[PDB]
Design an enzyme around this catalytic site. Sequence first.
Site, PDB file in Angstrom:
ATOM      1  N   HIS C  96       4.171  11.686  -8.655  1.00 47.44           N
ATOM      2  CA  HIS C  96       3.939  11.971  -7.212  1.00 47.44           C
ATOM      3  C   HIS C  96       5.067  12.769  -6.451  1.00 47.44           C
ATOM      4  CE1 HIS C  96       0.677  10.565  -3.865  1.00 47.44           C
ATOM      5  NE2 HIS C  96       0.916  11.962  -3.910  1.00 47.44           N
ATOM      6  N   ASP C 119      -3.092   5.891  -1.910  1.00 49.59           N
ATOM      7  CA  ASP C 119      -2.041   5.438  -2.659  1.00 49.59           C
ATOM      8  C   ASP C 119      -1.828   3.780  -2.659  1.00 49.59           C
ATOM      9  OD1 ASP C 119       0.296   5.236  -4.393  1.00 49.59           O
ATOM     10  OD2 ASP C 119       0.816   7.261  -3.595  1.00 49.59           O
ATOM     11  N   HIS C 121       0.917   2.731  -3.195  1.00 52.41           N
ATOM     12  CA  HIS C 121       2.297   2.769  -2.506  1.00 52.41           C
ATOM     13  C   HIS C 121       2.340   3.538  -1.402  1.00 52.41           C
ATOM     14  CE1 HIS C 121       1.852   2.157  -6.861  1.00 52.41           C
ATOM     15  NE2 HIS C 121       2.790   1.111  -6.745  1.00 52.41           N
ATOM     16  N   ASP C 123       5.220   5.512  -0.939  1.00 51.89           N
ATOM     17  CA  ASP C 123       6.087   6.629  -1.422  1.00 51.89           C
ATOM     18  C   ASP C 123       6.968   6.972  -0.351  1.00 51.89           C
ATOM     19  OD1 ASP C 123       4.670   6.170  -3.828  1.00 51.89           O
ATOM     20  OD2 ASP C 123       3.685   8.097  -3.705  1.00 51.89           O
ATOM     21  N   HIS C 136       9.355   9.568  -7.322  1.00 48.53           N
ATOM     22  CA  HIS C 136       8.105   9.504  -7.267  1.00 48.53           C
ATOM     23  C   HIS C 136       7.544   8.750  -6.190  1.00 48.53           C
ATOM     24  CE1 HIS C 136       6.248   6.577 -10.301  1.00 48.53           C
ATOM     25  NE2 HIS C 136       7.500   5.997  -9.628  1.00 48.53           N
ATOM     26  N   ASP C 227      -3.347   9.826  -5.039  1.00 53.61           N
ATOM     27  CA  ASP C 227      -2.352   9.244  -6.171  1.00 53.61           C
ATOM     28  C   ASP C 227      -3.577   8.244  -6.747  1.00 53.61           C
ATOM     29  OD1 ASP C 227      -1.260   7.458  -7.965  1.00 53.61           O
ATOM     30  OD2 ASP C 227       0.549   7.231  -6.685  1.00 53.61           O
ATOM     31  N   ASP C 229      -3.596   5.906  -8.600  1.00 54.96           N
ATOM     32  CA  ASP C 229      -3.220   4.305  -8.757  1.00 54.96           C
ATOM     33  C   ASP C 229      -3.667   3.846  -7.545  1.00 54.96           C
ATOM     34  OD1 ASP C 229       0.548   4.461  -8.452  1.00 54.96           O
ATOM     35  OD2 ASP C 229      -1.131   4.421  -6.786  1.00 54.96           O
ATOM     36  N   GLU C 272      -0.661  11.317 -10.668  1.00 55.45           N
ATOM     37  CA  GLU C 272      -0.461  10.190 -11.465  1.00 55.45           C
ATOM     38  C   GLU C 272      -0.989   9.857 -12.658  1.00 55.45           C
ATOM     39  OE1 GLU C 272       2.605   8.962 -11.316  1.00 55.45           O
ATOM     40  OE2 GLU C 272       3.483   9.381  -9.675  1.00 55.45           O
TER      41      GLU C 272
HETATM   42  N1  LIG Z   1       8.027   1.662  -4.393  1.00 57.19           N
HETATM   43  C1  LIG Z   1       8.404   1.593  -5.795  1.00 57.19           C
HETATM   44  C2  LIG Z   1       7.036   2.005  -6.675  1.00 57.19           C
HETATM   45  C3  LIG Z   1       7.081   3.422  -6.523  1.00 57.19           C
HETATM   46  C4  LIG Z   1       5.679   4.180  -6.921  1.00 57.19           C
HETATM   47  C5  LIG Z   1       5.311   5.292  -6.904  1.00 57.19           C
HETATM   48  C6  LIG Z   1       4.005   5.851  -7.370  1.00 57.19           C
HETATM   49  C7  LIG Z   1       4.049   7.528  -7.028  1.00 57.19           C
HETATM   50  O1  LIG Z   1       3.005   6.502  -6.404  1.00 57.19           O
HETATM   51  C8  LIG Z   1       9.498   2.632  -6.092  1.00 57.19           C
HETATM   52  O2  LIG Z   1      10.123   3.051  -4.940  1.00 57.19           O
HETATM   53  O3  LIG Z   1      10.083   2.631  -7.190  1.00 57.19           O
HETATM   54 MN   LIG Z   2       2.113   8.025  -5.052  1.00 55.36          MN
HETATM   55 MN   LIG Z   3       1.201   4.872  -6.440  1.00 58.40          MN
END
Ligand SMILES: N[C@@H](CCCC[C@@H]1CO1)C(=O)O
Ligand SMILES: [Mn+2]
Ligand SMILES: [Mn+2]
Lengths: 313, 313, 313
Positions: C96, C119, C121, C123, C136, C227, C229, C272
Site C-alpha cells: 500500500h 483497510d 489499518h 496507514d 506501507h 487494501d 486486508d 496487498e
Molecule cells: N500500523 C502498522 C501496520 C501497518 C499496516 C499497513 C498495511 C498496508 O495496510 C505499521 O505502521 O507498521
Molecule cells: Mn493499507
Molecule cells: Mn491494511
Amino acid sequence: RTIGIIGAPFSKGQPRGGVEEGPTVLRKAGLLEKLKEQECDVKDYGDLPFADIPNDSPFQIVKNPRSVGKASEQLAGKVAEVKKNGRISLVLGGDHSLAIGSISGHARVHPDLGVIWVDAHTDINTPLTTTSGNLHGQPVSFLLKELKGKIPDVPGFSWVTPCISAKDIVYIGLRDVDPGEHYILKTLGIKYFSMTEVDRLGIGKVMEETLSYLLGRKKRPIHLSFDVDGLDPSFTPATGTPVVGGLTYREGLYITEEIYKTGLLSGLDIMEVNPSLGKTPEEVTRTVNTAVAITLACFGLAREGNHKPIDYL
Amino acid sequence: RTIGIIGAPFSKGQPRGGVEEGPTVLRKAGLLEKLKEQECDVKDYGDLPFADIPNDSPFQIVKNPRSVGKASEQLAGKVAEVKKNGRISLVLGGDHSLAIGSISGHARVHPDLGVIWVDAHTDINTPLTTTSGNLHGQPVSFLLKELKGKIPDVPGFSWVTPCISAKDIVYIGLRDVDPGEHYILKTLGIKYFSMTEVDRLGIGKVMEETLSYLLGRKKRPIHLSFDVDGLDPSFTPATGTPVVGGLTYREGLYITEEIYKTGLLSGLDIMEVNPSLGKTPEEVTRTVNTAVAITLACFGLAREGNHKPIDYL
Amino acid sequence: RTIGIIGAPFSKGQPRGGVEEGPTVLRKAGLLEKLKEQECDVKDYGDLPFADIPNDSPFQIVKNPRSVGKASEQLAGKVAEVKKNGRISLVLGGDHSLAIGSISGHARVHPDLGVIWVDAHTDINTPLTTTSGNLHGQPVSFLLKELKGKIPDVPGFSWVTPCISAKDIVYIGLRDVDPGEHYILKTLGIKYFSMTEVDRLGIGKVMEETLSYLLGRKKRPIHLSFDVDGLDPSFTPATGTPVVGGLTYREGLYITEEIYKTGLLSGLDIMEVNPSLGKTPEEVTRTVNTAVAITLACFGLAREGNHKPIDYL
Ligand SMILES: N[C@@H](CCCC[C@@H]1CO1)C(=O)O
Ligand SMILES: [Mn+2]
Ligand SMILES: [Mn+2]
Ligand SMILES: N[C@@H](CCCC[C@@H]1CO1)C(=O)O
Ligand SMILES: N[C@@H](CCCC[C@@H]1CO1)C(=O)O
Ligand SMILES: [Mn+2]
Ligand SMILES: [Mn+2]
Ligand SMILES: [Mn+2]
Ligand SMILES: [Mn+2]
C-alpha cells in the site's frame, strides 16, 4: 478501569472437566499483561482453591449440589471483597454455575446492579424444570426474587438470597432455550434478544435498547456474565455446549465496546472456556484469543484505536 | 401445523444425479420425528415413483424435457391432493425444476397463493434464453402468466398452465442471475431482494417488505420454494450450483421464522440438496442439518424457545 | 467504464516480498478478460519496471525510503497519463505504500478528488510516529496537507506535494489503529467507519453516509484505495498484515457496487495481495478470486444481474 482478577477453576456445574483450566489458559494468554498494557489498574486475587467435596450425591436429579453451592458461596465472598476494594471484579471461570456466587457477591456491595447475560442459553432452569441436572444451566433461577418459592432447599445453597428481579436482567444471544425456561421467560416478563431479535434489529439497535432498558430510570452498576458459547462455535469452539448460528466475533466486540463506554461496568464473568474440548490446538487458541479480545473490549480496547492524552505529533 | 410430506427423488432438471437422494438423507436425519416432536400433525405421502423415460432427446437445447415435465405433472397431482386434505405440502426434492409441479398443484386448490423464492438464482430462464438447457434453471418461466407466449411447446409440459403473475412472487438471495433473466426481471417488474438489498436493508427489513408486498392487499396462502444454494456454501456445500456470498444460517432461519409467524404457510419446497456433492462426510451432514433446521423453522421451531400451553412451574 | 490497467509489482513498503506478484496472479486470474466480458473498454499499460536501488539505507527508522519514494514517483506519472487518456486508473499493486504515487498522480489531473480508503489499518503513521518503519503504513501521512510540517525530508520523496485535505478522505473497515494514528484521526477530524461503526450502522448506512459526506457539497471524482486486508482473513488470507473481524465478502461487494453506481469512480487501487503468504493453494485462489470480484464490482458487475440494452425475449 480498576480491575480485580479472580480465577475460578471449577467444573462441577456440568460433566466435562477441562473447563476448570479456563483461568490457566487465559492467564497464559497474557491477559493480565494485556490489561496493564492499557489504562488498567490490575490486581490478581489469584485462583480460588475449591476444596474437594467427596460426599456429594445428587439432590433428586441435580448433580454435585454441595460442591457447586460451595464454590459459588466462596466466589461470592471474594467478589464482594474486590468490589469493596473499589475494583471491577473479573471472574475467569469454569462453568456458568459460578454466576450464582459472582452476581450474589456483587449485589451485596451494589444491590442496585443490572445484569447483561450473553449466552446461547438462558441458564434459568430450576431444580424442578431441569432435565440434565447440570447446575450451569440453572444459575439464573437461584438469583431471581420472583422464582423464590419454586426453588427447593438444595444442599449447598442455603446461603443464597435472590438478589435481582426479572426486570434487572437482559439476555443477548439466545438460540437453545428449554420449554420450561421459555415459560419462565414469558411469565416473568424477562427482556431478551434471542438470535432472532439480533437478526431483525441488528446488534447496534439491540445494544441501544439493552442499555436504555437497564439504565433508563437511572444509572446503575452493570454486571456482564459472558458465556463464550454465546458467540458462534466458529469463534469459540472449545466450549461444552456449542450451538450453531451464534453472535459473531464482531458482534461480541460490539456488545463489550458499548458496555465499556457506559463507564458503568462493575462486574464481569468470562465463562465456559474448556481447552480440553478443542478438536485441535488451533481451536483452543482461537477460543482463548476470542475470549481475551472480548475481555479487553470490556476495559477500553477499541477497534477504532486508542491513544493517551498527549500530543503524538 | 398440519403437514403433508412428499418425497420427490428427481434429478433430470440438471446434470449431477445425487440430488435424487435428497428425500432419503433428509428423512434419515429424523425430519418426520423432529416435526412430530413439535406441534406438528405429520403424514408422509411417501416418495413419488418417477418412471424411467428412456426416450427423451433434447428439445433444441433443453435437456430431458419429457422426464422433467412428467415428474412435475406427477408432483402437481400429489400436492393438490395433500392440499385438498387440509395439509401444508412439504416437498422434499431433488432439483428445482420440480417447483413447476409443486406450485402448479398448489395453485389448483389455492389459486390466490403468493410465492417466496429463496435462491442464489432466479430460475426464470425460458427454453429460448437458457444457455445450459438445464430445466432446474427455468421453472419460474413456465409458471408466469406474463411469459405465456415466449414459452415454446416443449415435450412433457402441455399440461402446464401459468398460475401466477409476476407480481405474486418475491425473490430473496439472488447473486448469480443471467442477462436474459435480469431483462425479464426488470421488464415484468418482479420484486426481488438480491444479496445487495439484503446487505443494504438487513434481513429484518427485507422480510418486512416481502411479507407486506405479498400480503398487503389481503392475506393469501404462502408458497415458499427454498433452494438450499440460496444460503452460503459454508452452510450448504452439498448442492450442485453453489455461489459464494450467500445468506447466512441465521438469515435462513430468520426468513423461515418470520414466514411461520404469518400463519399463512401452505406450501414448502426444500430443494437442491445433493449428498453426492459433499467434499466430505461432514459437508453432507452440515448441508442436511441446515436443511432440516430451516424446515423446522417453517413449522414453529423458534430460536427464542418454545413451550406448550401449560404451567411449567 | 473506460479502464487503464497499471501493474505495480512492488514490495519494499514492507518486509514480505511475495506482494510484488500481485499483478501477476490477478492477471492470471483473467482480470482483463473478465472486465472486457462486461461493458468495459480496457487498456493495459503493463507492469511498471521498478529499477533496483541497491543503496537504500534506512532514514532513521524508515526502511527502503528511496525505492519506495521512487516507485510512487514512477507510479504517479503513469496514473496521470492514464487519467489524461480519459480512463479510470486500475492500479494492481504490491504493498500500500504505492498509494502515495497513485493518489498523487490522480490528483494532478483531478485535484478535486475524494478518497475512500478500505483497510483494516489507517496507514497514516508519519516517519516520526511509525514504530515498524514500514512505509506501507505511512502513505496517508504524505498525502495530507494538514500533516505538512510533521513529515521530515525523507530520501526519495522530495517530489511529493500533499494533495488532499483530511476532510476529503473516508476510512472504512478499521480495526488495528496505532496510538499516534488515532491521535491524528481525532485531531484532524478525519471521517472514519471502523468495524465498530459498521457493526452499529450496517454497511448500507455506512455507504450512504460515506458518499453523502464526500459528494454532498458537489460531485467530484472518486479514488478508491482498496487494501484487501480490510476484508476478513477468511476471505483474503494471502495478505501480509491480516486482522480478524473484518468486512465480509458481501460487505466488500456492497461497498464497491455502491461506488460503481455513483458513476464517479476515477481511480482504484487493489493492494496487498501476497500469494506467497497463502497457507495453501486454496487460500491463494480464495484471496485472488475475492480480489477480482471486488474489482469487477467497481466496474459494473452487479449481484442482482446485468443485461445489455436489447430485447432478450
Ligand atoms: N500500523 C502498522 C501496520 C501497518 C499496516 C499497513 C498495511 C498496508 O495496510 C505499521 O505502521 O507498521
Ligand atoms: Mn493499507
Ligand atoms: Mn491494511
Ligand atoms: N438448558 C440445558 C443446556 C444448559 C447450558 C448451560 C450452559 C452454561 O451455559 C440444560 O439445562 O442442561
Ligand atoms: N442460470 C443458470 C444456473 C441455474 C441454477 C439453477 C438452480 C436450481 O437453482 C442456468 O440456467 O443453467
Ligand atoms: Mn451457554
Ligand atoms: Mn451459560
Ligand atoms: Mn439456485
Ligand atoms: Mn433454484
